[model samples]
Target: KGEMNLNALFIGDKAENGQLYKDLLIDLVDEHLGWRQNYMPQDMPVISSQERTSKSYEKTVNHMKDVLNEISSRMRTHSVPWHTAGRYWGHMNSETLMPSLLAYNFAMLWNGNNVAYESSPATSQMEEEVGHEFAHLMSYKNGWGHIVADGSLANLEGLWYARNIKSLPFAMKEVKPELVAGKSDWELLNMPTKEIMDLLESAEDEIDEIKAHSARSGKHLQAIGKWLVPQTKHYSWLKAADIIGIGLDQVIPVPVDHNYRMDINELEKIVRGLAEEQIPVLGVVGVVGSTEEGAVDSIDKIIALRDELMKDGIYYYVHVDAAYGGYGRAIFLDEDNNFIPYEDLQDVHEEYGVFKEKKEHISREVYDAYKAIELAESVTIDPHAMGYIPYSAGGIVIQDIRMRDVISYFIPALLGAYILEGSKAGATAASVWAAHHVLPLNVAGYGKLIGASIEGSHHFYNFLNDLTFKVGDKEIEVHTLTHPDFNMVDYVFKEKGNDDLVAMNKLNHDVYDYASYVKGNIYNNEFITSHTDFAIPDYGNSPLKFVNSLGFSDEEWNRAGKVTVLRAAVMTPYMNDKEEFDVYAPKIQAALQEKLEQIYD
Candidate 1:
């Protein structure tokens, strides 16, 4: 009732209406089967088919059924109930929307490949529409975008564009002065990151230009400077650097704040140091939602830092890696495409989910950060993550679409005119297109769903913080690692009056192991959650600072040299239900206490 608009179609008692969902799906599947049976074209001759009474045909059908049934039985054995919502808080995979699934099912029948317009005219057009929609959603007034297979590829392309665009000016200025003579500095700067790439691909015949420049400069034209990212960055950046041939050493890991957001000061310092060394600053990446803690980097501050650096002629491309939180921006929009003011946030939160406390968690800083995301030169978003689209749907958007012309390859025989993804499923594009059609990508649509997830995560954080359990004579307290910046919460369990880091680590690890272990008869199996481990060295000593900020002594942290905690991603909108929490909260409480008792004894 809250989100569904097709309510009139399901008019009946609750159970009867509930039956409608399954019945409709089954009917559609039946229709598909019927259509395929008579799929022969009227223009084409039909070939002789094997008779149904043949031994081979009968054996094949029976064998297929037996194998399928066994596969189903094997699948049923897994305790990781992702669809029904046990405690799957590890990854971003979740139950996709009905429209997305239906759209995918429908499109897969066609088996369209969106690599080229000629290959899939209709779906190719649909992909273009979906790409532009995301561009608009990311606040690109006249932007360009395309869908990729995953976020890792999206990130790789981001750096690819950044490297090509940022290094072009130096390459062209030295290689062919006459070609770039009239182009002003600002004009070159505003050109798409792909502009240089296009020129390079086309300039194979212009080897004289490069040779002349090489002789004049006595040095090869290579990408100089570094790409900055937070320690909490997804491992894709490292892969991107290696894949792009830009040596991994150039990908700098900047320190993060106590909340795990990028330390703006540290980033500025690093950039200034690179500037002094005369190395070109290729780009700076600001993470909108970190994978580990779901902490949002201060994009506004990062942009401001870039602006200040530009004043000193130290400009670099700004890219936002918002794979998991890109759709959350919809929460700021309304039906009329206007930003919803902060005063009305509480009302929106209440409409989404109920919290024990009525406070608004979307602070002004976080609000500003989301708003500033549009200011970036490029952005990476994942439809599979926050867009709630099916898997293999990652997207990249540039401030200017014309830049795509630079990287486009057009061989008469090869498919696709432009785009990094060579061959991709048109079904993925259609799924996103259908999802957008049903749930508008705006605040009233996808934003509402994302807001509910954040609300639920916040709801759980509050519940855990206020909860306490007793293990015999010992008392245990559980608290979140940090206040959730998005819909992911990292929390830890500690026995009261026991501050030993070794025991604390073991206690938390034991709880995580017991809760997540699938092959055993365990209590408190009602919820599925995850865990992550962090050491001071891996985090660039930032975890030490974080621990220090949390009022833990250095001696305690040094004892174990690492921290382990339970992680929960409240990505499921169903988690907003108070009824589920009534059952979920107590099970976690009991299981944690039981684990603590075991550890204490």
Candidate 2:
């Protein structure tokens, strides 16, 4: 929003911008061929001694070119053109950044595997360096982290690491009773989470002996306690619970407040109840950005409760699921990497320009939650989603480096021991490293890119809330689900004075089916969107208040069961430009008007 020129970061929505990508890639492509040909001049290929270019090799090469064209043809025919500014606003995708794309293109040639350094030396090293970058970005100064396949794997890794830590205290009592001499089973179970790991170091010489009695050894598997996650959690949480040997029934889904954020009252109530039942609380997941509603749970309050509980020697590990909103942390920081308090940030809005454009600062609750992310034991982040890296690059960062030892299987003879997958792509790691290199993870760099999206979300959310249309004797008013905590905006269109829940549900669904990416309409729809439903049973009445605002009572909502709401993840940095937004905004509104005409006209 300031003097930051984000235009240089991404390949733009126009043909001229495509030329920039071509020139940059051509330069790298030539260098890659040169490097390969120059690697070994001492020995020529044995096949070179046999034949000239006319070879069947030429035909095979031609076929390879044909196959590449075939795939590109299909991709062009069906793939959503998310980069086109006015056409796509559907999901957590924007155009991939130029630096990451260039790095991925060059690294693909090497085809290195990061599972072991023997197979991939440079990228493996970059992964470790990038891991520290991720750690520092999350304010985990002394922490350790690593790349994973996606947020799902990162979520699972966080859980596995926490589960092992929960059982280590009791396991220590078994192997070396003197270390925990006077502690009873209940006392040992409630020992502070970090203290359990700190306790392990006291018996480093007996680690191998203790490993035989720990949770991983399956001896203390049944003793591991329940997990607390918001009902607004990503599906990965449920899968993570089942994957780790904690049964499906053991994971508790805490209800959310009216804003769709996790209710702190429920969290404290349930955790205190667990303390009384002597059911050790394994960990609590604080969600920074939820899936459908884009809600941010109160991590500051969650951490405060953890501190309150630990006063009595009862501890619950804290992990933050920040996959969608993790990068927003950059918004709270300044050029020197100091976390600017919300009041100070508001004071500098004109100088910073993030709030100057819209006259809006992020909510204090969202601001405090991001600040508290640093205190959690583990956090899950994604480069693929918000970092603008190519697909499948998600990460997990742990506050303590020592925690890796609690879960590692096979490692730094290569780096795979603590990771879930044995053969992970080094290309993804190289892509992330190059992205951070080009745009360092600070206020002046990626923060500018992330801040623009936050500003745009606010702009668009306000836009929808202010929209009113009169067509065919009925006025259509847009109702947003809630104020967005990040870049996604969700809402439903309601006919003025119309109160039927099912009628409204189908009206939104009709809009969704028409404007969505169907084959016949993909080329025609001015703007594309996706829709999601929140049922009372699924989300535990979290949708009740929003439904009530739509002119339905709780009784009506219960009878209907759910409401379909249209969603737009306003992720493109292009929208941050006033000129660009001026051109695209009306086109999208007109497109919605056309969709409405088909139903009401």
Candidate 3:
């Protein structure tokens, strides 16, 4: 009785049944604010009307083609290969199977939200369950995971809690008269010490004044110090610190060695120097996949230093920004997966002359990178990055559920915050739930998914090596994190006399030109890429915005400024093999170069 009921599904395909189900789904999706009608005015099929032409539909179709053409043409003009991101379109058994087209039509009909039990009770429960699954995937058990509109918000919330709790002691203190203005040390010293202490303790309730005092204390006392980060760290960290009133001066950007991993010695030196000054070390952010280079930081070394710091009575929470690498963890989970191992990398590298024998052994560390994350108190991971989902979804997973209570509106009587947000949308949660559930977390499911990422990376590496490009009279190359941690790569492109700022600026300027040309040609089909400046006080600054080729590499640089490198993150599940890449990679480069030649003087 419980066996496959093929007849029941066939029965549902009848015209009447199909129409009924379609109407239900259509009605449901239409009801939600987040879910606009899938059919835009342009999507409508042409219908002859005695009425004036339905220009909207034509406009929509035109817009779509324009976008695609622009992307393709950019690749063509720049002399790069194909441009649709080189995703295989079907990796994991996804393409082999037909989708269950009509199973959850009713979900759209109801338009449930999941922020609270009262608002979307059924979907809320579903969301929570899904959150738990994700939590487990990231190796957290006692902690709680909640979805936000996007990962940026999730990260903001995480830092908000970290800062508030960390600053509690200072927040509840008082201020002194000299703290307000110009009392000399002797004038203040002559006054009773008890009176001075009392004034500060008494002014605790004046938060605005307290905040001002905090500012002054840092400027006056200057005891507050910076948060240490790798040179490749995210820009969001600066903004996050600012939001929490942490001065940018307190954000210390550490250097990364040739491999793009934080320099442990340098990091230790910075930490120790801050410790000697008795300045509070805010926290250290270890990045899993840098948005710029897709580079994974040295998790093992960062955690080890953190442990040593704790022994010195210095405590700083380690927050791992695993936004782009968490999904890649699947490859290392299983003992017997066909997925490419770091060792196999050497064999491939041997085929390409760029793979120098000295750098022969790249890291096998990325394999155990997760265990390092588990060592962190909090983590920021984005579903939109590796999950291949549409935009507007990112999450922060905390190791302690209690942290949630700390950040929320805690009320003593209620035990935890009880504020209710009305009607949160359920569509995102449902989609995410469907994706994770369909691709379960075990070796068989997740391993398969993660394997594809590794495989894609492998293909990418091969592609990069196949072509030869030189930067700064040296080899143009990238550094993979020493150990196998995740599917991340960090490479710098340098040509003779290209490392300097003026030259670097020219390179970055060229990248912008290329970006523009690509956009201009097809309107919007160019695969997106990002670039950033790496500043070192002593080295002055490398003005070239390091570009992430994002599925493109090597001789791809047609109009090189300095070593204007770019990241090539093959994130979509669609990217599968070399065939697709061959078609897409050159197109992106050509588009970039065309823009450069056209725009740059």
Candidate 4:
């Protein structure tokens, strides 16, 4: 969208960038570093050192090179789906980890620490550059970010930003707001540092007297911010609220549609109702992918609401927890950088009245998605999830970098927050840098990866949809993508064969129990998926199981009504190929059929 020449830097076929990288790495390893005099057995021998033993360094280099080539080579093999995407250690990408490994091995020879500019200046600069690149990937033009140990640190950093944004105003008010006001309260707190005390006291006086008194008790009290999310949203939102001493009540879990997407209309009504009541909505949290069903919220619709409401001087900071589908955003744009419209976004069937007719509104633009994502003030994307990075990689992109300054309470011109002795390890940084560096934000890097994931999900749905092809089969159907959202399928089993169903239902009472057992077996075999429940309500009530009967008395039927069917996520890169489907589809159906029939019989 801008002057960024990502293609020339990474995807171009020319050897200029490649040669530069190779030369830089070889020099870093051989000239300025030191290798272990005695290497540990756990450590693989460096390709350069393979010559020290019986291995030829050239052969070692060639062999390592071939292994690297295999990653990209295998991805193109027949274009069929694999049994599963390797979860722990199965992802193979020659363009990424291979080069990173080579780079790191080269660095290890010099024993360079890449954590800071002072310690590992070369690797440190590479990491800093990578972090900047991450910001661009998420469309955070103004905000700044840094890499951390893992996903948890990344998440913690995101929450820290959230918490800081909510509380930093108070910090500013406490320290310096009054200096501008020309008011001083240095006499009130009875402090020795008059200038600083005067500043603090002056700022403290700006607070409402009641709040000011409470501040003396050392109990940090923050007015709770509103958190609007789906019932299917993660528990972390609540944890975040509590961590900040914001009561759990501050976090509002909104309802979801039948398909598990946040009911945008419901959210609108709620927001409007809250506005009418003058209830402040500090922030709204929308998910790119729900944990339970992999449901992507209507960010476009959410953005429209915010835009519409902005006229009233009521603005809620929008934060998207896109830990799951953060990568999904890539394929939304084609190679030409044109936005790809999602199927459902095309025609939104809107009901005019509560009890009246509904009208279908066709999306004329690429999709409302641009508005949704573009409108968001901040976002959390876990590269570890879809980016397929090894571990401990997640990212946050904020629309206004200034806002991050507010949230992080970051002093713009300061040194690193913590004291450190040496340069940081370039190894982990190399992994993340290698992946993103090789894969730019175009069709090949993000689009190719996420496009495959989306296609896999679609194929998965199509396969299941085909099963319902037989007339009167009365099978449970996944409704999430009946029209298609983002490839997550939410299905419930249609309970049949029960004329006096209650009594017969005893055999099926523990449907989840049986389902879990079967699922466990499937999982052990490396079949990964997800599930959800309908019983959960906002505030205090817990998740409820699905109910099949209108009014039930039989123990057998009672058990049958409580357990809902499972939810499945087809979000894998290998799921796109039809030939792979021809092989695995029947195997899965057969296994499922066998499990169900055995349980019933």
Candidate 5:
């Protein structure tokens, strides 16, 4: 009953068991607030200086009420009705699981810090368990990881680890061959960065070589080194380049296909080109669920590319940016922890024309990519996103425990030496640990939640694609940018006669403006969604190629130069219910019709 109640809260089933979804929280907060305010004893001893003085007691009480009232008023106007059964489909906001929310409140009372065990012994242990759980979810046996504030920090730490490990081989061989003699590349790569830096600092000749190399290339040795990532990557990668001592120039862009997945052929071309230039390839990042398009890159193909090129003395580390889609891996596992057979997936595909079907949600290629993420050296996953936890919980898991050594540092007061941030909130750890305890991160648990969202995405896609509106003696049409590879769908409105590049752009621009205005107004709104611009440079500066591939002429595409589309993320599990989807689909269409009519006006 406890688990069911929590799940009901997570899916926003307000009327379940004859109680409102948020009423439980309202009562609990009221109880706590009453406890804080009560005067239980007539002659209770004074606890603080403020308690002894009643001169401003009424002022404090009145101010507290005013602040609470202001907070309540402001919250009513916030964008995206994430908790309501509506089309609040912009970002990856979902109803945070009840267990996590309660756990956060419970632990926050103690105000524990996870930086050191001395600060928070119980929560530090809980963090360790949370790390182990994340590794297990990613299929990393005997691996290591820890939680951070969010995905951007997790991504930064991933690239930081990759940079340190990739540089170790060169640093050891050039600066201190004697120390590394008979020590395999594996052993040296696992050595601490401090030790490697010490060795390099001791060797003046090697230091001179590094300086000379930098001078020769007019780039820092770190800056000259290149890392490859898809064009659909998050903005954090560009920031990561700046943070890791690698200039933005070294962060190479690999083109994504029309489906917004990284083009493997283009990836191969970039890797080969860099190899021929005698430049070391630092890392190849494969995104599982890109931020804008929710497309999963082909990780298996990327691994094959790395292996194929290694025969010619070219090698690079592999990292998967699975922050948004990592939790979906639970769907591939059965109750017994075995991978679901391809036959089973094919059966579903045949029945529903999903999963195994190309252009359908969760295609076979996307499934294989999720499975292949375990093979990467390191990966980033966010519990706050798909795991249905509260905000600001991102994790990184390394397949090899030894890789943790590269960035590990010891402090006498600290419990673990593997964390990226020194002073983090223990409440986050407590929240995640409690969530995993109540709802295990397995197929029967997290998988059901994720599968529902994916189903909702597909259902929404079908409805949007088939929707038509009559406008000015002709019909206006809606089309999805591409079929979703996950639970996010991008679509646009196009008028039939005037639906060329320029006109389509204008229609979508007006549609987005009107929708945003209505949603932001708070007094009048039906649906809330977001829009993104896919500019020429966003597709790796090949506007002609990307635009022409979208069934547009080169002249028209070049003239328009970009496309703005409405992006909806079906991230709530409630959308899985047929009645809920039925209620929302027409609301979406009606809202579109109203927007189009307004634009026509």
Candidate 6:
């Protein structure tokens, strides 16, 4: 029933579920029409009974209809058929949920600005509820989460929270020295991030004074320090760093293991070295879903690292950029929203009936990572990415609502001061609230949606790994990267036993060209995908091992400078059916067969 119900959420490849979507839209329009008509003095008629048959009024109405027609024509002509067209394995986009679309379309009419509750009464309440829903989704016991204007801004806010919180202890020391009379300067600097906030509670009387003197308050700018970000991070990290005054050079790259996950051991080495040099480590970022590879760093290890660091009086702040894969947390949750114990996780999906097959890629470690996200000090999650809501909505969930006090420039229970910006679309807030309202945030709702994407990715991963073609006694081999921690998959094609680096790179690059964003007819690309280039400059020697698997030598791997691979993000919810999902495998195979066979021929 869960699987069956989930499919009806999407409009479908053939628009089979279009009725539910269409009816909801019409109902929303009708409700809004009634809402406007039923207001006071309805008989007065704002447009005026005399103007109804006026030639100018009739012309104005016809002009609007003509423009709407023109817009419809342009969209039908040029839009990439991501939702309705053939096999959309393109990027992180899909059919926005029925409820979310309807709510946004209707709420947009009000033009509610979420800057303050006074300005947008109902949407402000909806925004608050959505914030609470995000908190529930992430398993934050008493924490608060709220929408940001963009996902990138969520990263900026994470840095904002970490920076202000990092310097709060020092700020407190100057204003309220008695609270930490015995604590040394170095000791204050090394106090755990949470402990600093706990100490803030003791000095609540002087909170404003300490905030004035804090790093974010712009008084003691020197207290800010370096960040240890894993290499597999979104561009927003560096953008956040530079924008927050930490400077781009301050974001030191941490290495990844062969599997592309953060090498926690290396992270410790950097952390230890920074502490020795007396350069304060502001925070460590764990990428939950790296845009290119969809790598989920072992957040449990990062949390444990902070504990170990704190044992030596070293305060380590933990931030997770779960912007892409944050919603995947639903998979780890049970029907009651509890993190499913790791032991039962292996077989837990058996009851769901839909997710049993992809359990091969579900690891104890990845399970531990999702389960441990709540333990992090702050997290950035995107509703549009995996929550399947539309654009202009991203979020940040901090462990304590009280922490919002440090980042504020408050004016009237106003959301303006707390967020990265003032006046975001209340429609965005409404859309996300409707999604959370109509669908449970627990295992049965978002989990079912996200799980289906992961299951689709698992099969796609297997198909790529096992793919081979015999071309005149020579076999062309397709190499898949290690099993994904989440849904996106990266893989490359190389001729078996072929050792030329440039040749291998070209074949894969050309295949990517053939598969994605073909010029002229954008709609006809049978199986659309995205492409990425991994070079040694950013990723270090991590790609060397995978390059070697494709039969490239050490010298050649270094000489080629980079390896280009096809990127597939299976974010669609409609792929849950056995036949519906299986159909894509052959289409992808045939798509690859024709493309690769063309190259071979």
lDDT for each candidate structure: 0.72, 0.82, 0.51, 0.49, 0.72, 0.80
Best-performing candidate as measured by lDDT: 2
User: Which candidate number maximizes TM-score?
Assistant: 2
TM-score for each predicted model, relative to the true structure: 0.86, 0.96, 0.62, 0.64, 0.85, 0.95
Worst 10 residues of 6 by lDDT: 352-361
User: lDDT tens string, model 4, 500-527?
Assistant: 4333233333333444434344234322
217 in model 6: Cα distance from truth in Å?
3.3
Model 1 ranges with Cα > 4 A deviation: 1-21, 26-50, 179-222, 347-359, 411-415, 518-524, 545-551, 577-580, 595-601
Give the range where candidate 1 is weakest over 10 consecutive residues by summed lDDT.
Answer: 6-15
Clashing pairs in 1: 87-528
C-alpha RMSD values across all candidates? 4.8, 2.0, 12.2, 11.1, 5.9, 2.1
Q: Write the per-residue lDDT of candidate 1 for residues 1-601, one digit (tens) a residue.
A: 1354322222222233456556666776778767876787453434336466678888999999999999987766653555544255556655677677767877787778888667777787888888788887877887878788899999988876776566555557766655467776544443434445455555676644543443123332244457888888888998988877666877888988778988899888898887776676778888988887888899889889877777676777889999988888877766665666778866764563322236776887778898888888788999999887878799888877755544545511223555766888888888889888887776657766776677668768888889787878877777678888889888887777766777777877877776766425433354457788877765655666655644568888877788887888777665655676566666656656665666668
Candidate 4 stretches with Cα past 4 Å from truth are: 1-115, 148-156, 166-221, 272-278, 334-367, 407-426, 468-484, 498-528, 538-563
How many residue pairs clash in all the candidates, one count each? 1, 1, 64, 13, 0, 0
lDDT of 5 at 494: 74
- If both were scored by TM-score, which would come out higher, candidate 3 or candidate 5? 5
